[PDB]
mmCIF file of C-alpha atoms and ligand atoms in Angstrom:
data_model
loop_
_atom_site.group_PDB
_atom_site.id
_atom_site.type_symbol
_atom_site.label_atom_id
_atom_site.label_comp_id
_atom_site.label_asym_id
_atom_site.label_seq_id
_atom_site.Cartn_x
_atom_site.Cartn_y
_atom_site.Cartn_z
ATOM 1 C CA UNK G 984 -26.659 186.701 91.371
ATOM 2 C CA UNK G 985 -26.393 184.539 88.425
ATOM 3 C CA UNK G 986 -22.310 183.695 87.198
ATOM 4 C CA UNK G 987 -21.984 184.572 83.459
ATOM 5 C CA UNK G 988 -21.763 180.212 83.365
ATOM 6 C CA UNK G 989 -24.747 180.263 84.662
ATOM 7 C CA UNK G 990 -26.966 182.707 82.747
ATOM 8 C CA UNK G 991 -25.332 180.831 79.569
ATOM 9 C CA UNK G 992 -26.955 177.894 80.425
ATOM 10 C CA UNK G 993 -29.989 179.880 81.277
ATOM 11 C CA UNK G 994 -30.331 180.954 77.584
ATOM 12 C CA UNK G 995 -29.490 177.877 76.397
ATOM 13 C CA UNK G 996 -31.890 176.091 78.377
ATOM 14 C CA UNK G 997 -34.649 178.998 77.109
ATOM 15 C CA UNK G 998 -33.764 177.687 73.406
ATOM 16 C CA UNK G 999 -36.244 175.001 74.076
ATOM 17 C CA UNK G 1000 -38.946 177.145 75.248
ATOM 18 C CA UNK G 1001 -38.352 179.695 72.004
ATOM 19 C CA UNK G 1002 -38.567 176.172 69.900
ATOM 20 C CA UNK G 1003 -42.509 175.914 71.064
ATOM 21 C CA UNK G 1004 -43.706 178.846 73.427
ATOM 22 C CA UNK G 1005 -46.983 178.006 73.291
ATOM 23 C CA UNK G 1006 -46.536 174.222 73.858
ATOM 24 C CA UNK G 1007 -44.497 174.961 77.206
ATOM 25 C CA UNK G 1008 -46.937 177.634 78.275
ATOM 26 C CA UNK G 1009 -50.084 175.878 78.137
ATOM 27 C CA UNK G 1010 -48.339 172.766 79.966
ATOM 28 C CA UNK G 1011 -46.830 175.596 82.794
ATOM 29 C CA UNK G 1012 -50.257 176.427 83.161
ATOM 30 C CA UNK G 1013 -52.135 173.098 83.235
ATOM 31 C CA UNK G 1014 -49.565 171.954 85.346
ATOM 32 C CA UNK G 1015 -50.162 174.632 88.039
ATOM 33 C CA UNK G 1016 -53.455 174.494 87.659
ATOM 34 C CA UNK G 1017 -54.175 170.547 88.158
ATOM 35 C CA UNK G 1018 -51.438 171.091 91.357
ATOM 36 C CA UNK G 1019 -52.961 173.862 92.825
ATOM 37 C CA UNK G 1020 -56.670 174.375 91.896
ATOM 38 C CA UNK G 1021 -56.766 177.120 94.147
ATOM 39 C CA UNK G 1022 -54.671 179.636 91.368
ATOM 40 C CA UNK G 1023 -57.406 178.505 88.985
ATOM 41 C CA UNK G 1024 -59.535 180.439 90.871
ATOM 42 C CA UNK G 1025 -57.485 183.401 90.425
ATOM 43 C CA UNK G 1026 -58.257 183.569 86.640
ATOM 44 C CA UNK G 1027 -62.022 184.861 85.838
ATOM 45 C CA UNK G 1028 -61.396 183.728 82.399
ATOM 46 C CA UNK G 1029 -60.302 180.177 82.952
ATOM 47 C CA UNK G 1030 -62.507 179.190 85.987
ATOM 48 C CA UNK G 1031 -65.004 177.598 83.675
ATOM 49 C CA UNK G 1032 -62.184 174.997 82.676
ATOM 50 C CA UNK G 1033 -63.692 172.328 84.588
ATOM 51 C CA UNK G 1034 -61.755 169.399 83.583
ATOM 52 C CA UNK G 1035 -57.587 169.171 82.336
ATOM 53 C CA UNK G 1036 -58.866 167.931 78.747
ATOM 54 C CA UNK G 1037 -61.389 171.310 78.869
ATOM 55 C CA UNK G 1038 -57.803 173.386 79.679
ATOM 56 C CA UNK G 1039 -55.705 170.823 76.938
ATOM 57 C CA UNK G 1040 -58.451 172.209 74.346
ATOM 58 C CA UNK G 1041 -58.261 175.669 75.091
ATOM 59 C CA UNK G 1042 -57.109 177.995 73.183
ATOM 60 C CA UNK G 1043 -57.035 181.055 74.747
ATOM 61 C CA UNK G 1044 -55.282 179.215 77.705
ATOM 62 C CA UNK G 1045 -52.601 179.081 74.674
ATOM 63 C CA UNK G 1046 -52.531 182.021 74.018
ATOM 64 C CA UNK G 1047 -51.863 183.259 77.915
ATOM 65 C CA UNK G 1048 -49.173 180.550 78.298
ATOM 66 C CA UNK G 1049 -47.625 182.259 75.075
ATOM 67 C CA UNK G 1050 -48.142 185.811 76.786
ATOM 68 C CA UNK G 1051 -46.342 184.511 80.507
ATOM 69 C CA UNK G 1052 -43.384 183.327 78.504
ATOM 70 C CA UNK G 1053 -42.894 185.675 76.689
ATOM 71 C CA UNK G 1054 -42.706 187.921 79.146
ATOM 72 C CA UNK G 1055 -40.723 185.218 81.725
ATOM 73 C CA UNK G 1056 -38.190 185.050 78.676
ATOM 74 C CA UNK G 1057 -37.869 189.190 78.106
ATOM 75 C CA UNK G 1058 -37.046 189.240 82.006
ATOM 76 C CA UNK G 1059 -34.644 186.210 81.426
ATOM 77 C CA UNK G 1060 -32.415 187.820 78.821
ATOM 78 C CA UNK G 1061 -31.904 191.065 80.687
ATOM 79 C CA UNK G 1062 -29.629 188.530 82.952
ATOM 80 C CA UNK G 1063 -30.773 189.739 86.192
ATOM 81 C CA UNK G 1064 -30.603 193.628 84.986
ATOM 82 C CA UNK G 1065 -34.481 193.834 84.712
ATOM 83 C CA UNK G 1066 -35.854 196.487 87.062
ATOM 84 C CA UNK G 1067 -37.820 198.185 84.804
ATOM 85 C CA UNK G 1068 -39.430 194.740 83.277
ATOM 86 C CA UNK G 1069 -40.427 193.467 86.131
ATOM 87 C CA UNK G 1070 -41.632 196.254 88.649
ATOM 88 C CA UNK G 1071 -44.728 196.683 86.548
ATOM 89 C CA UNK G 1072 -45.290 192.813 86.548
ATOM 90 C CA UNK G 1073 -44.353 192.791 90.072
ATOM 91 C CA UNK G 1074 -47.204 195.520 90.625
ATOM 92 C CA UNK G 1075 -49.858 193.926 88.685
ATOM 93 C CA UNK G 1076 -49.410 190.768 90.176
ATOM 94 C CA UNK G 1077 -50.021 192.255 93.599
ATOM 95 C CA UNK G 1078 -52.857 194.979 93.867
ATOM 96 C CA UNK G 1079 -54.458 193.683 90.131
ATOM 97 C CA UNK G 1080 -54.829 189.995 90.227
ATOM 98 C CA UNK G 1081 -53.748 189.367 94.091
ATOM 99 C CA UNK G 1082 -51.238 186.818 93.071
ATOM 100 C CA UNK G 1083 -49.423 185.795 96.723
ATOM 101 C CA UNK G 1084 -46.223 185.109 96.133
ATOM 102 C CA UNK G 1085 -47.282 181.047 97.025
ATOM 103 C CA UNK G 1086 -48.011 180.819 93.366
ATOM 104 C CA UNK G 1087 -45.418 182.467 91.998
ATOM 105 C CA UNK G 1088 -42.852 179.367 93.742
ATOM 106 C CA UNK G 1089 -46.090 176.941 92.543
ATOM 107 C CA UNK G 1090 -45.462 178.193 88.435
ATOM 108 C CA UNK G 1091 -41.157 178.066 89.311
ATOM 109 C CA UNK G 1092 -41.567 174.636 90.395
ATOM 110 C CA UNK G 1093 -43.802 174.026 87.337
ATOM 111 C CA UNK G 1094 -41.407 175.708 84.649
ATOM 112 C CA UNK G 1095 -38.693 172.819 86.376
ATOM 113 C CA UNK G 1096 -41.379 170.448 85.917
ATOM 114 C CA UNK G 1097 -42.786 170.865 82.331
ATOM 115 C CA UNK G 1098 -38.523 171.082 81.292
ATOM 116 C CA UNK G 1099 -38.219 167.194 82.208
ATOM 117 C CA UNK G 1100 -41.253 166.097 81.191
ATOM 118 C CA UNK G 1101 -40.404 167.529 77.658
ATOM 119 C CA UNK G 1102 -37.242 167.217 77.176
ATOM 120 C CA UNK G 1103 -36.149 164.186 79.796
ATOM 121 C CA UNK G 1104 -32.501 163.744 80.062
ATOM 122 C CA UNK G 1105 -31.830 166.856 77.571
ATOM 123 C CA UNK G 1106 -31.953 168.710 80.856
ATOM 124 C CA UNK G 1107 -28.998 167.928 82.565
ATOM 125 C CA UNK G 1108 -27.985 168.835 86.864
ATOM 126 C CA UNK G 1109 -26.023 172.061 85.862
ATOM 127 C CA UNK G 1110 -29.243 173.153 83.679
ATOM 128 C CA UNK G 1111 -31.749 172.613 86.434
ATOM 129 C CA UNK G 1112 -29.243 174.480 89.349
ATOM 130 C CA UNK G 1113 -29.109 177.234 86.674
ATOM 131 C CA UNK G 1114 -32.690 177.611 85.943
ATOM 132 C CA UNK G 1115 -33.503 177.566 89.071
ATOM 133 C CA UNK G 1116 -31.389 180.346 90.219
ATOM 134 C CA UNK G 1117 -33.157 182.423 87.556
ATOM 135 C CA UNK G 1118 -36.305 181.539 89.157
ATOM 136 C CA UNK G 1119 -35.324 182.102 92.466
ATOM 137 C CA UNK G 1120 -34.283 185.317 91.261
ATOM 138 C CA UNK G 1121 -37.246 186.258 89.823
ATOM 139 C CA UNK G 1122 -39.448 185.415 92.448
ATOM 140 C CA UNK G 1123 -37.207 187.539 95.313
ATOM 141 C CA UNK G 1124 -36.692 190.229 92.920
ATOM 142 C CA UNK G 1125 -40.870 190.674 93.051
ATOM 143 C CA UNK G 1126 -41.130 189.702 96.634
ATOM 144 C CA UNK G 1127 -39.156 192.679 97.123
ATOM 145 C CA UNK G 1128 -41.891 194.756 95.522
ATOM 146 C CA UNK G 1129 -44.821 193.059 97.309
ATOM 147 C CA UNK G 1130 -43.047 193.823 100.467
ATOM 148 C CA UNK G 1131 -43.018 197.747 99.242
ATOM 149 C CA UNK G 1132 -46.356 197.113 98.435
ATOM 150 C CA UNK G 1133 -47.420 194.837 101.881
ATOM 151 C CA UNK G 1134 -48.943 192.871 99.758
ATOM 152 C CA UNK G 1135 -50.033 189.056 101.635
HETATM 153 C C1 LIG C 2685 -51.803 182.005 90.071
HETATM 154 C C2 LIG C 2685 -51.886 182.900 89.096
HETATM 155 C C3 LIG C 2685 -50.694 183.742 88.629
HETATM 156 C C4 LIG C 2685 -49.253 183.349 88.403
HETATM 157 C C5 LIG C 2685 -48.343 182.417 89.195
HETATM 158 C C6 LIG C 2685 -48.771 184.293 87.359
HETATM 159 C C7 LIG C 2685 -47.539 184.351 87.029
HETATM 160 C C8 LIG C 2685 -46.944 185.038 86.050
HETATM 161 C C9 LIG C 2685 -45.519 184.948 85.664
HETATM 162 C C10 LIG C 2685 -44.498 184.067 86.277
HETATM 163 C C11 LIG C 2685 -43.629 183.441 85.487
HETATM 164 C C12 LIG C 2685 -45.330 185.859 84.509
HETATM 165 C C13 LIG C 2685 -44.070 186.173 83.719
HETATM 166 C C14 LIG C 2685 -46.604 186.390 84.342
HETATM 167 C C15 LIG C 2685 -46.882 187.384 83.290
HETATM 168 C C16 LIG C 2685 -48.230 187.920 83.046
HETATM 169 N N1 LIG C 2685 -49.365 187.665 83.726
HETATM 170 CO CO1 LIG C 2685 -49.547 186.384 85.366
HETATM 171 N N2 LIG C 2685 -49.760 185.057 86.876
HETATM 172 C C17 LIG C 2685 -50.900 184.751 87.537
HETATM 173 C C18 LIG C 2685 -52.089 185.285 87.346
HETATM 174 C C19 LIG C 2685 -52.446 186.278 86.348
HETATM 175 C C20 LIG C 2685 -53.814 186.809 86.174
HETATM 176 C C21 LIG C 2685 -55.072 186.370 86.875
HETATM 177 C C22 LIG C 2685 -53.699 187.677 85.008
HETATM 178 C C23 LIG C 2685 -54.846 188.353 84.258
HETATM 179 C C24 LIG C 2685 -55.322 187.312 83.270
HETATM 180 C C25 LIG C 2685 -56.324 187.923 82.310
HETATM 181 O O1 LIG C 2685 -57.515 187.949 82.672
HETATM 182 O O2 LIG C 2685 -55.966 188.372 81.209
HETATM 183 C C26 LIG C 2685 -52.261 187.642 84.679
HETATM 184 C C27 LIG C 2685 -51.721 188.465 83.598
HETATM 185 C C28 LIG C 2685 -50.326 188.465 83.170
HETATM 186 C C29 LIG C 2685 -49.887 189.282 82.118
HETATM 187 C C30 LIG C 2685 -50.643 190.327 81.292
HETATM 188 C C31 LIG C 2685 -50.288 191.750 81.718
HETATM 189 C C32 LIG C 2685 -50.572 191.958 83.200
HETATM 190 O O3 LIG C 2685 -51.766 191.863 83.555
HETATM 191 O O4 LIG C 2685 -49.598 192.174 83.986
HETATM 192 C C33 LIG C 2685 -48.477 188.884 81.955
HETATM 193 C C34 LIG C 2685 -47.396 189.375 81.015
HETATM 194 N N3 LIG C 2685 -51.559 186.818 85.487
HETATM 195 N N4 LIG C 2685 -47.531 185.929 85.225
#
């Protein structure tokens, strides 16, 4: 688990996010996307985005990156006590949209990514190790169900 340090700095850290949701979601996205064309392909309604200024203009891609934070950031708050949030996600992710659990580390490493590139040096050593613990967390914590599931 997280220390009670460490989820602070979580939440603080998720003030930036809350400042523009949709601004970090569509970069999350576009990032994973130009890194890892393969997810693309997981997304019937994005696989016509073609080029990264046809994703940039999109705004239904928006609009998901708002919906994925959103519900990254409901999980986050619950500090670590978020069974019931993220079981269902967990489940969708599996036997809906066959999500392997690859791409779930390829958006973590994003989330760390899009953090520096908008707010560079505002996102200090302790920050990252805490955000990524969160992430980690996250990721196990529905590894756990695709495992229940034998899901990939
Ligand atoms: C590589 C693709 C992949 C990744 C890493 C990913 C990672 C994450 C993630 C990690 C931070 C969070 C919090 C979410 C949260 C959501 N995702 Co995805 N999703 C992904 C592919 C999808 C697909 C595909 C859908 C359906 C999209 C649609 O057509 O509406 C989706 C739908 C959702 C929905 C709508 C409800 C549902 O269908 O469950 C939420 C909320 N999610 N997702």
């Amino acid at each position: 688990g997280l220390s009670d340090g460490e989820w602070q700095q979580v939440l603080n850290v998720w003030g930036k996010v809350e400042a523009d949701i949709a601004g970090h979601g569509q970069e999350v996205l576009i990032r994973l996307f130009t890194g890892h064309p393969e997810t693309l392909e997981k997304f019937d309604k994005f696989k016509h985005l073609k080029t990264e200024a046809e994703m940039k203009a999109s705004e239904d891609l928006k609009k998901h990156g708002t919906v994925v934070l959103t519900a990254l950031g409901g999980i986050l708050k619950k500090k670590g006590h978020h069974e019931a949030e993220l079981k269902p996600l967990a489940q969708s992710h599996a036997t809906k949209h066959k999500i392997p659990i690859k791409y779930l580390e390829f958006i973590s490493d994003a989330i760390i990514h899009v953090l520096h590139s908008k707010h560079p040096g505002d996102f200090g050593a302790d920050a990252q190790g805490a955000m990524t613990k969160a992430l980690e967390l996250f990721r196990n914590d529905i590894a756990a169900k695709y495992k229940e599931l034998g899901f990939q």
